């Protein structure tokens, strides 16, 4: 179509399970283009569908531009064009850098604001359904030039129909990254007919992302090396069974160092992590509550 024909692909930046991401140039601006082959149409259409949700746009959700198709004369490519963020993922960003207390708050608060907006239902003519991500992880969050985050990779999301309490794709199977799966997802006790259960599972994964950020907070030169949650307990690419034995059976969570109690910002962050990590989903903090807590901390710090 008219958009893909005017875009020049410059570099393949990533190869995921669904599609390949490229840095492209559109009307002289950098854009990110996710390309799927003809046989991945279901995945491409679903992601285009979630990104076109009414009232979805928010400073902390990846800016979607357009879905399109491009025929090179041999095969057709299915495109999803979005805003380009040079830092890339929060995973890449935390591996490369350490952050200040201010930097940590900015990353955590923006992640929570994006999640609170996904989770929020807006009632009306131009109403927005509540949305649950189902695959929140530091590799699915991007860092913007201003040091704030935006949630990306919404292709596995589910949308709620509030009047009937029904989910748009009626999920009957476990999806997402095994390492970040909530205890109720790992042991398959989650009620997949209960939308609030998917919001609660996202909060647990956001808790693990906050732990990743806090390790990289550098105070008086003190900080931890980058690690994925459960790095000390499971192998790389862990199985459901491996995760379940740790999270559900032994009931372990990532370690919270006592030295996070000697700094106010880290203390608040530690308290949030613990309250995201309860085995009972109903006891977890909401994304709005986390946003309110970190907004108060940001104000106190003068960011």
Ligand X SMILES: Nc1cccc(Nc2ncnc3c2C(=O)CC=N3)c1
Binding site, by residue number, is 13-21, 34
- 193, 262 Cβ separation under 8 angstroms: no
Please identify, among the stretches 84-92, 116-124, 217-225, 226-234, the one whose residues bind ligand X according to the rule CB under 6 A: 84-92
Does 195 bind ligand X (CB under 6 A)? Our answer is no
Cβ atoms within 10 A of the Cβ of 174, count?
14
Q: Which CB, 82 or 138, lies closer to ligand X?
A: 82
Q: How far is the CB of 57 from ligand X (least distance, A)?
A: 14
Nearer to ligand X, 34 or 128 (CB): 34
In angstroms, give the least distance from the CB of 12 to ligand X.
11
152 touching ligand X, by CB under 6 A:
yes
CA distance 220 to 277: 28
39 DSSP 8-state letter: G
Which of 68, 135, 153, 202 lies at the binding interface for ligand X (CB under 6 A)? 153
Q: 217 by DSSP, 3-state: which?
A: strand
Judge contact between 23 and 11, C-beta under 8 A.
Answer: yes
**Rounded CA Rg of the chain:** 19
Residue nearest ligand X, Cβ-based: 32
Q: Where are the beta strands (DSSP E) in the chain?
A: 7-15, 20-26, 29-37, 64-71, 76-83, 131-132, 141-143, 149-151, 158-161, 166-167
Residues annotated as part of the active site:
135
Please answer whether residues 185 and 81 qualify as being in contact, where contact means their C-beta atoms are separated by less than 8 angstroms.
no
Rounded least distance, CB 63 to ligand X, Å: 8
Interaction between residue 21 and ligand X (CB under 6 A): yes
Q: Which is nearer to ligand X, 50 or 270 (CB)?
A: 50
153 or 202, CB closer to ligand X?
153
- Tokens in use for 55? 């009232």
Among residues 24, 88, 114, 229, the one that binds ligand X under rule CB under 6 A: 88
32 or 290: whose CB is closer to ligand X?
A: 32
Residue among 4, 79, 85, 106 that touches ligand X (CB under 6 A): 85
- DSSP 8-state assignment for residue 61: B
CA distance 129 to 3: 28
Count of residues touching ligand X (by CB under 6 A): 15
Binding site for ligand X (CB under 6 A): 13-14, 21, 32, 34, 62, 80, 82-85, 88, 142, 152-153
């Amino acid at each position: 179509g008219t958009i893909a024909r005017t875009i020049v692909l410059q570099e393949s930046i990533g190869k995921g399970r669904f599609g390949e991401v490229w840095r492209g140039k559109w009307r002289g601006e950098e854009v990110a283009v996710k390309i799927f082959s003809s046989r991945e149409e279901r995945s491409w259409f679903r992601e285009a569908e979630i990104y076109q949700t009414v009232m979805l746009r928010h400073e902390n959700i990846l800016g979607f531009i357009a879905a399109d198709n491009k025929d090179n004369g041999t095969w057709t490519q299915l495109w999803l064009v979005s805003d380009y963020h040079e830092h890339g993922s929060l995973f890449d960003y935390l591996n490369r850098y350490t952050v200040t207390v201010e930097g940590m708050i900015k990353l955590a608060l923006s992640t929570a604001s994006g999640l609170a907006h996904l989770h929020m239902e807006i009632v009306g003519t131009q109403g927005k359904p509540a949305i649950a991500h189902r695959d929140l992880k530091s590799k699915n969050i991007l860092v913007k030039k201003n040091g704030t985050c935006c949630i990306a990779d919404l292709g596995l999301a589910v949308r709620h129909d509030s009047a009937t309490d029904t989910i748009d794709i009626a999920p009957n199977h476990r999806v997402g990254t095994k390492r970040y799966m909530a205890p109720e997802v790992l042991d398959d006790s989650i009620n997949m007919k209960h939308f609030e259960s998917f919001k609660r599972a996202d909060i647990y994964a956001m808790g693990l992302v906050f732990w990743e950020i806090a390790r990289r907070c550098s105070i008086g030169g003190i900080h931890e090396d980058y690690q994925l949650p459960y790095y000390d307990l499971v192998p790389s690419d862990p199985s459901v069974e491996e995760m379940r034995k740790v999270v559900c059976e032994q009931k372990l969570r990532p370690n919270i160092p006592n030295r996070w109690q000697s700094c106010e910002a880290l203390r608040v962050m530690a308290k949030i992590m613990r309250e995201c990590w309860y085995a009972n989903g109903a006891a977890r903090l909401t994304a709005l509550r986390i946003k309110k807590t970190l907004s108060q901390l940001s104000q106190q710090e003068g960011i």
